[PDB]
Design a binder for this molecule. Structure first.
Ligand SMILES: [Mg+2]
Ligand SMILES: [Mg+2]
Ligand SMILES: [Mg+2]
Ligand SMILES: [Mg+2]
Ligand SMILES: [Mg+2]
Ligand SMILES: [Mg+2]
Ligand SMILES: [Mg+2]
Ligand SMILES: [Mg+2]
Ligand SMILES: [Mg+2]
Ligand SMILES: [Mg+2]
Ligand SMILES: [Mg+2]
Ligand SMILES: [Mg+2]
Ligand SMILES: [Mg+2]
Ligand SMILES: [Zn+2]
Ligand SMILES: [Zn+2]
Lengths: 50, 52, 136, 179, 116, 46
RNA sequence: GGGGAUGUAGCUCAACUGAUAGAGCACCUGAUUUGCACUCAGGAGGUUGAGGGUUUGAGACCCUUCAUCUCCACCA
RNA sequence: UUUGGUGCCCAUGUCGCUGUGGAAACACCUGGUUCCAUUUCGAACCCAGCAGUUAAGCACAGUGGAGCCGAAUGUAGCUGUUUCAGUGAGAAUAGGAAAGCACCAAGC
RNA sequence: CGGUCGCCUCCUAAAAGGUAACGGAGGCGUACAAAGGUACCUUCAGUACGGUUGGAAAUCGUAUGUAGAGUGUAAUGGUGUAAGGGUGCUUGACUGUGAGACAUACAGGUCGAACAGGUGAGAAAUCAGGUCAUAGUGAUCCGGUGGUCCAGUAUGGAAUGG
RNA sequence: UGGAGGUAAAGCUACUGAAUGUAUGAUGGCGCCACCUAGGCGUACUGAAUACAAUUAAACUCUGAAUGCCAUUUAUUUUA
């Protein structure tokens, strides 16, 4: 199988809380979305984590 | 349950991510033919409407 | 040799010949016709024999029509092969003739040869044939 | 435009009497002059297309929108999503200005403006003018694209009959042979 | 390709279909129709398919087509709706972009006790 | 639409033989550009 | 899963440790024989694997990656 | 009752042809200086006004041309029992058909 | 010996669902930071006519045409103001859950009203817990990584676990 | 009594293929014209367009049952 999955971690508590998909070949730039965080209990920026 | 909407939804009837029709309120289900040349099917949930 | 130019599916299910007559039931191009009395599978090979017979016993101005056409194919497993390992390959094409379908019709020549011509066409075919005329 | 007022009075009066037109707006009215100088060289020399736009701009005063094909062709090396052709549609005051500038300045500078008519209406009342070369237009400097092309100026009208469209053309004195 | 009225009807059909699909609380439907001269408004109820309240430039006797009289029309229709004891409404246009006269009518209706 | 760098300014046009000062909007020099062949200077029109 | 090292003309390679990229081969030209090669010399062929960080000074030092290699590990 | 708006309907509601109409309204129309807009065009959308207008659209009357609908009889398939009793199509036909049902505002 | 071994679509499958054969035809082990979400606007392919390069067929204008167009894909079903195309703003491709149902030997799978938290679009109503829908997937054991309000073999840690 | 369906049948101007025969026959079509290359036209014609009249299909449907299925109403029966 192919591995197009990636992990998204918060940028305040630096915890990884989400699992999504990304094409490294097509999209070269790291994702920087903003989603809800269970720890901080608010919306905050989540960045790609190795 | 269907693949593609073979029966349209009416009142008190919802839609899903698999084009599955589910009820939204209590009542008796009832089919009504509609559309050009009566070729379209529609489902609804006529509420109990007991109304004393 | 009448033959379909192409088919979507090489190996279709066989088509039954039991039943009455769906289409091609009444002479509508000529005015005398060879009707069938027993549904059966007759192949494209029999058509040329019957057609060649009619053509050989025709004249210089007679005209003929072939209604039925061998659309559907049939297969035949090679000899000494046990059943399985898929369906056989199509071998010969047969036209489905039901009881009451007008197969051949003739016109534009005197009465005696046409009766004789239809007779020789029907002796080349397995079905039990009969002569009919056109309603005025 | 003063000639626009001339259009108003003259088209109304002449056409109405010429056909006993029962309403002032029964007379024909011209709608839009589309210009389309399109080339497939943008598939390879894209730069070329860019220069085109500015010249088209310089011709009409409206910036041209570059159009894209709705299909893909291998022999022309064409593919969907590419820009091949610009179209400009003039209305209001600017459309009559360009028409007048064309018939009075651009057209008589044409090398051999012998004209073509009667065999040009599309059957619905329209009219297309196929220009062969761009340098002849006064509003163009000698420096231009390495390739020279023409234009496809077209016309529209309120009426649907080509004969009545010809009547407007004659009333406007659009200079063609016998038409 | 068409005339303005047909496009407005097309937009009007879209809005009515969406509202009839999603209006679950059976709110009254405040349809405003703007013309070249005047703009009118009617509060239909898609469950009973009748008109409960109405207001129009013709009813109010005004040289309408201005943003000023749109405020008066909204006040009258909102006053009528309050007397009818209906305050939970859905506001849709006749198929025209929500702006100018339509926006003035809607804001006038909201400031006179309506909930939308 | 507006807010453009190429302004359509009303320039007048003269011609030889017949003066015929035609005033037309264009994005060129705001001066008397001389045309050598105008409409009236053409064998076809007259 | 780590640890190290390598990446430079089209190819094969020096790497010109910061006070501002070179050689053989590939190719063009010249000479060069009765002809073919051979032979000699010029020219051309370099955005230093890529991005970021620091000094006045880095392809060159630091960080990050990409591809390659050799090692180890390598009981779902 | 008529005009205008709208919901329900989804051609027996269409497409087209021939005429008539506007009092109020519907519309074209007059301009882009304002709010707003063009992948570019006040074309459209949005403004503020009704000078002109019955071509349009729109509304009425006629039009059986195209499209649509379609009776009864009979027949093909079915259920039983018969080798006859029901059930009864499709196609074809006589033919119908120039929409209909409600709500609101105005002169009626 | 050759062929096949999991999942998806059609026919056989006998107008509910289900139904086999080494029966007849095909695909899949994905793709998209937009092809998601929202608001607004907008609607075929082809053909006819007229027009420089330009040609049977590139683009333009107009008409006709009721889907033969598009809907990433193998088929089926759906969908022509839509679920197709464009633009603006965004990341709901959320957290904790979940009454009630479909289908099932089990294990698993599918739809989902509604509640609380905090968001996106929108004037608002409303919509958003990934895409028009159905393939795009592998149990347990074992070990590794991050967090952690749990344990820490006398006690405090640590090791080692949860 | 209500509903879902798309089979039997039937039909192919209501699609997708197969495809009888024919109405006229555009065009392509041979020769002749006409031209060096296309045509008009006698073309021993073929072929479009549309049609008429007739056909075929498990993977064709503008249609289209009965039986069967689900639910409900009434009567009766059994504690499964
Ligand atoms: Mg009139
Ligand atoms: Mg084996
Ligand atoms: Mg079944
Ligand atoms: Mg069954
Ligand atoms: Mg598909
Ligand atoms: Mg979007
Ligand atoms: Mg989508
Ligand atoms: Mg183990
Ligand atoms: Mg201890
Ligand atoms: Mg111890
Ligand atoms: Mg059958
Ligand atoms: Mg057919
Ligand atoms: Mg069938
Ligand atoms: Zn956090
Ligand atoms: Zn002159």
């Amino acid at each position: 199988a192919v591995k197009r999955s990636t992990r998204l971690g918060c940028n305040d508590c630096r915890e990884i809380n989400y699992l999504t998909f990304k094409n490294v070949k097509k999209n070269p730039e790291k994702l920087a979305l903003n989603k809800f965080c269970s720890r901080c209990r608010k919306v905050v920026v989540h960045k790609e984590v190795k | 349950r269907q693949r593609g909407t073979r029966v349209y939804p009416g009142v008190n009837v919802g839609l899903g991510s698999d084009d599955t029709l589910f009820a939204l309120s209590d009542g008796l289900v009832k089919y009504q033919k509609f559309g050009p040349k009566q070729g379209k099917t529609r489902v609804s949930v006529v509420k109990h409407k007991l109304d004393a | 040799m009448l033959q379909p130019k192409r088919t979507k599916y090489r190996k279709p299910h066989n088509v039954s010949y039991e039943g009455k007559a769906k289409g091609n039931s009444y002479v509508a191009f000529g005015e005398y016709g060879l009707v069938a009395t027993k549904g059966n599978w007759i192949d494209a090979r029999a058509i040329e024999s019957a057609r060649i017979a009619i053509s050989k016993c025709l004249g210089k101005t007679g005209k003929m029509w072939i209604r039925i056409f061998p659309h559907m194919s049939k297969t035949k497993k090679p000899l000494e092969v046990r059943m399985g390992s898929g369906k056989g390959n199509p071998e010969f094409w047969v036209a489905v003739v039901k009881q009451g379908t007008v197969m051949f019709e003739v016109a534009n020549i005197p009465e005696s040869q046409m009766i004789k011509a239809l007779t020789r066409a029907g002796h080349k075919l397995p079905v039990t044939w009969k002569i009919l005329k056109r309603e005025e | 435009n003063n000639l626009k007022a001339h259009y108003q009075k003259t088209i109304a009066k002449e056409l109405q009497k010429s056909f006993a037109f029962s309403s002032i707006m029964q007379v024909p009215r011209l709608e839009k002059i589309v210009i389309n100088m399109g080339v497939g060289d943008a598939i390879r020399d894209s730069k070329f297309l860019e220069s085109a736009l500015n010249e088209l701009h310089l011709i009409s005063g409206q910036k041209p929108v570059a159009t894209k094909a709705k299909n893909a062709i291998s022999t022309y090396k064409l593919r969907a999503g590419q820009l091949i052709g610009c179209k400009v549609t003039l209305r209001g005051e600017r459309m009559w200005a360009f028409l007048e500038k064309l018939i009075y300045v651009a057209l008589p500078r044409v090398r051999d403006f012998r004209g073509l008519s009667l065999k040009s209406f599309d059957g619905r009342g329209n009219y297309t003018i196929g220009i062969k070369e761009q340098i002849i237009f006064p509003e163009i400097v000698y420096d231009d694209i390495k390739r020279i092309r023409g234009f496809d100026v077209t016309l529209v009208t309120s009426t649907n009959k080509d004969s009545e469209a010809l009547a407007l053309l004659r009333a406007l004195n659009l200079p063609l042979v016998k038409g | 390709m068409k005339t303005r009225t047909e496009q407005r009807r097309l937009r009007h059909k879209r809005i009515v279909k969406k509202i009839r699909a999603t209006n679950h609380d059976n709110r009254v439907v405040l349809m405003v129709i703007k013309s070249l001269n005047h703009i009118s408004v009617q509060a239909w109820d898609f469950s009973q398919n009748i008109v409960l309240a109405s207001s129009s430039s013709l009813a109010l006797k005004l040289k309408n087509g201005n943003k000023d009289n749109a405020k008066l029309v909204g006040q009258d229709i909102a006053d009528k709706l309050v007397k009818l004891k209906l305050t939970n409404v859905v506001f849709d246009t006749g198929g025209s972009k929500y702006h100018g006269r339509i926006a003035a009518l809607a804001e006038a209706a909201r400031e006179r006790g309506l909930n939308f | 639409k507006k807010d453009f760098h190429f302004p359509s300014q009303s320039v007048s046009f003269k011609c030889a033989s017949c003066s015929n000062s035609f005033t037309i909007e264009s994005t060129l020099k705001q001066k008397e550009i001389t045309i050598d062949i105008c409409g009236k200077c053409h064998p076809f029109y007259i």
